[PDB]
Design a protein around this ligand. Structure first.
Ligand SMILES: [N]
Ligand SMILES: [Pt+2]
Length: 122
């Protein structure tokens, strides 16, 4: 029942209904979620329903993937924030890329605890 890695995953990588998913969105949400001291070079947020993200950890919405990971069956609205410049330290300028695809996570105790950022590097 230690769900600290799960709640930290939601803080770093979940935003249920974001509205506009533009550069302005990235610069504000990266500050809100505490990902700017220092500036995280890439960070992806998953949108939609929490339960479908949890379900990646089951055969209901996931397949095993590479050494220790799982890849979702369903596609998710996502937004990738990429650091522009320059400096590791704030102010942190971000380029947003809105996407729609499956996601790769690590699961522990049936909860996502890590997002594999490599599929969003592109
Ligand atoms: N992580
Ligand atoms: Pt991680």
């Amino acid at each position: 029942q230690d769900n600290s890695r799960y709640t930290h995953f939601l803080t770093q990588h979940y935003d249920a209904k974001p509205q506009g998913r533009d550069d302005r969105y990235c610069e504000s949400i990266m500050r809100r979620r505490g990902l700017t001291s220092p500036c995280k070079d890439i960070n992806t947020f998953i949108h939609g329903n929490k339960r479908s993200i949890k379900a990646i950890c089951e055969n209901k919405n996931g397949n095993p993937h590479r050494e220790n990971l799982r890849i979702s069956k369903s596609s998710f609205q996502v937004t990738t924030c990429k650091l522009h410049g320059g400096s590791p330290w704030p102010p942190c300028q971000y380029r947003a890329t809105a996407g729609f695809r499956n996601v790769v996570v690590a699961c522990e105790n049936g909860l996502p605890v890590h997002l594999d950022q490599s599929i969003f590097r592109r």
